[PDB]
Design an enzyme around this catalytic site. Sequence first.
Site, PDB file in Angstrom:
ATOM      1  N   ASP B  92     -23.001 -35.590 -38.415  1.00 13.34           N
ATOM      2  CA  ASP B  92     -23.984 -35.126 -37.534  1.00 13.34           C
ATOM      3  C   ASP B  92     -25.021 -34.317 -38.352  1.00 13.34           C
ATOM      4  O   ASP B  92     -24.766 -33.485 -39.095  1.00 13.34           O
ATOM      5  CB  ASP B  92     -23.425 -33.947 -36.682  1.00 13.34           C
ATOM      6  CG  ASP B  92     -24.457 -33.196 -35.851  1.00 13.34           C
ATOM      7  OD1 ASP B  92     -25.619 -33.232 -36.213  1.00 13.34           O
ATOM      8  OD2 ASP B  92     -23.814 -32.400 -34.828  1.00 13.34           O
ATOM      9  N   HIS B 300     -21.944 -11.167 -51.941  1.00 11.95           N
ATOM     10  CA  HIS B 300     -22.018  -9.693 -52.064  1.00 11.95           C
ATOM     11  C   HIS B 300     -21.327  -8.871 -50.974  1.00 11.95           C
ATOM     12  O   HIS B 300     -21.869  -7.779 -50.792  1.00 11.95           O
ATOM     13  CB  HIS B 300     -23.478  -9.221 -52.448  1.00 11.95           C
ATOM     14  CG  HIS B 300     -23.503  -7.934 -53.275  1.00 11.95           C
ATOM     15  ND1 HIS B 300     -22.917  -6.887 -53.054  1.00 11.95           N
ATOM     16  CD2 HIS B 300     -24.074  -7.818 -54.504  1.00 11.95           C
ATOM     17  CE1 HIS B 300     -22.823  -6.017 -53.956  1.00 11.95           C
ATOM     18  NE2 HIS B 300     -23.600  -6.437 -54.866  1.00 11.95           N
TER      19      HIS B 300
HETATM   20 CU   LIG Z   1     -23.889  -5.572 -56.827  1.00 10.20          CU
END
Ligand SMILES: [Cu+2]
Lengths: 334, 334, 334
Positions: B92, B300
């Site tokens: 897909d 992060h």
């Molecule tokens: Cu950082």
Amino acid sequence: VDISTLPRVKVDLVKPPFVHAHDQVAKTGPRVVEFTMTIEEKKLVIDREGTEIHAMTFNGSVPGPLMVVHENDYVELRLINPDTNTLLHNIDFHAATGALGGGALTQVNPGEETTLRFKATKPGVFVYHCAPEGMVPWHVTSGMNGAIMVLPRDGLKDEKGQPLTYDKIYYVGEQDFYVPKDEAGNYKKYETPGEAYEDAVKAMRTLTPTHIVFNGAVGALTGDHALTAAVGERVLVVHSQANRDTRPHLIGGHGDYVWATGKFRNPPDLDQETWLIPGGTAGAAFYTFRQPGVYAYVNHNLIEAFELGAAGHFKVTGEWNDDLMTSVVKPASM
Amino acid sequence: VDISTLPRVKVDLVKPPFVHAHDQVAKTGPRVVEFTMTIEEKKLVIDREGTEIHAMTFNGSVPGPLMVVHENDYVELRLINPDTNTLLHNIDFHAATGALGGGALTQVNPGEETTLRFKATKPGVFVYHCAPEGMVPWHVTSGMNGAIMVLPRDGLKDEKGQPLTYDKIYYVGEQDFYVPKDEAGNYKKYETPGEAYEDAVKAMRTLTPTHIVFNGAVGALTGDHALTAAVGERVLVVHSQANRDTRPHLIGGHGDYVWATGKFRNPPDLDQETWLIPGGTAGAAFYTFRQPGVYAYVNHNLIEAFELGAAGHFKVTGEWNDDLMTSVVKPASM
Amino acid sequence: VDISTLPRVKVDLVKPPFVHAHDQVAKTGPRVVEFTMTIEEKKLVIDREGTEIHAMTFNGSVPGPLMVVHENDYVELRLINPDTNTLLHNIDFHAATGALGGGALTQVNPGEETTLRFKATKPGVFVYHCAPEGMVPWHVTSGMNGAIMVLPRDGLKDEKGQPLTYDKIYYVGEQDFYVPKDEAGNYKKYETPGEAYEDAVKAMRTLTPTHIVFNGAVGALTGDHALTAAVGERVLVVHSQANRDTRPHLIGGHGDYVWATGKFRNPPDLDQETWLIPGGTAGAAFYTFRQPGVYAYVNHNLIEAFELGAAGHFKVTGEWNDDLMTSVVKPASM
Ligand SMILES: [Cu+2]
Ligand SMILES: [Cu+2]
Ligand SMILES: [Cu+2]
Ligand SMILES: [Cu+2]
Ligand SMILES: [Cu+2]
Ligand SMILES: [Cu+2]
């Protein structure tokens, strides 16, 4: 200015995913548009196995209706709280200004009424939701939220300043339910909301939803309720989320023009395969179909979409275009 | 047009984080590029303590390979499902159009083959993943996903219309695994995927991952496999995520140019310290190093990076530049 | 160049949500600004029921102070680690370059000192946080993070190139705490951090916070500490988040100009009702009030805001403006 010298219009809303009649280009000067919404506390069944919750709604639907107005107009809302309800409700617009967006002026006990007028000064899609002091998450995650669109006076404009016209407009609200369940893994049932309040608070503190639904029910936009269109038609989908981030996706198509925050003063983005709509905001997507068939409309956190129920459907009529995508060799068994 | 009058090219892909040979500027007219991917179901060990899962992969790797083509070209994929596998797979593309991005045409049982041709009409980075009806999250979170880049015909261009050239190009796919574990906190082991399916569904419904890995293994881009570069070199990192939001970060550097949604028609952003890539999309980051040493490449959400394994490394050669950053006083003991 | 021929300035920081004195337009050439931060490990009480944690802080506050400098200046930081502390700390700027943003040069044991000079080459708001090898999430989610603003040399500029001036500037850092709790649902208490480390790691792996606070305490910006303003004043709110995504919202107002990633080279967005700030970055919002009263400042994941404590307040003086929003009919009992 003296508003008593401005025209007045009366608009009665429709149940989503449909919008009331309107005009994408302003035909007159600023007016005063008049809406009337009624509050309703009722039991709902949200999934296939008949799980029931105590939803609170505007006009008896999740989500509430979409109100379309023009920029620099005056919105006058008449909110009514009947007597068979049992809680204190109040509305709150993200498009208004001051007094908590209108929440400090609209508190109504059971069996009361209120009007409120404000000015729609910024164009874009905004969210409105209930907000009683101390029960904001409970009221808003039981279903008391909706959206409102404030078009510019010349209609939409792409990033090159050229106009934009949509043949159809649909509205989709994604609702996350935290239903409390016991130690046996079964969802608990109650009599009236006041009893369920505390385990509702606990379940919410768990911070993960139990259901995520389009139009307040699993499969509510699937099967015979699929959203219809035709090849070459232009559709504007408004998508709202009042509490949690969401990432819409149209399996098969794209986003021709996308306002991912829903504010029309900014230039749109182009060719989005998946955009992000933060929690507590609305966004707009303009798309014109090219190939016919069945499209899916999902929240591309695939677990949520295909396990908690955040999926709807599109039926587009027409015939194939084997230049864009063709099957050179049919699936063959070697 | 009659495609039978267009050239044909044969490309054989490489294992990530490396890309096959290509040219950032089109030397010819539109062609028909030909890829051939094989499906493989195998056991994988993803962490240090030898936790094993039943991964499903394209060409036996997590993620799949990156396919680089040019805009308005024709991609012709030949997907093969051998006989030792046991499930029904189908591909897909988020770059195709119609028929669920090619998912309704590519269903292949064990021991079958299929070809599919589509046109790459929009430039940017896109995601492809398996999608069998009813087992979409399971297949896609077992490892059946990858990316595809569709360059413009004149190569990249910054927001001022000036060209952009990268010396190196790397590809990173972030994969989140929900391995089921028993009441003892130990990860459960099975025989074949069909047995693990149901507790896999339960673990996914918990909605939090157990592992998050770059290139399908904890530490797979750390140590001797670190990504190499030199001071003053220009690198393009493509980053893909098929199910969950991610926020890449290059500890020490920045993002000189960033397409956070991965669509090259839009202008890029500048000097990003950390951008957001929604779930189910890909993004591109162009950076040219200035100081030598060891850089980290993390997600992060620091908990995920330094507890679930979403971290890789960069080794850049050169010598210091004590004007940008110097240690006036060495760490001294008073 | 020879930096010894550049002026030197001495700046002593203030406790948030206030910023030290500065000038939005550079009066001189590049200088060398000098800061001095001290590390402090202390017990904190974060909620109403006296839940205590072992916070680690710069200058004894959560978050750390905001450092305002100008572009192409030289920042010289003097980090001091006293002897009564017990851990190894080191700072890390997202605005620096090389050596993990300064983390490989700043490791200081108890009873040590360090200086570090770097050049602020990119304008915008950035985040700094501790980063010891192997305890990064623990140190950063115990409270060792803050922000730093690098203004352009001509001050801010909107998307039309016209200047922008703010009368006030406030700084808000959102901190998420994962306090470990036993089987009884009560939060556990310890002696010193080293004991709490392991159950802290477990709680973090659960991946959902237990508290979310503005300025390191539930209600720290509510009541008599509300942020003050006047109708027609111009305020810049800087908002930082080091580990988790957040979506700020000003109930009643809007965002006149918004840098959602905090980089001033890009054009801002307009009329934001709610923007998204990824984890590990900072953002800026410029707003000028129009109506007086009490505004709320929340994280519009309403569950987090009104159940975990991510809410503050604004007191703006002035008198009403009944053209923008008026109550046509007072709440009446039918
Ligand atoms: Cu950082
Ligand atoms: Cu309510
Ligand atoms: Cu709101
Ligand atoms: Cu598959
Ligand atoms: Cu997809
Ligand atoms: Cu530290």
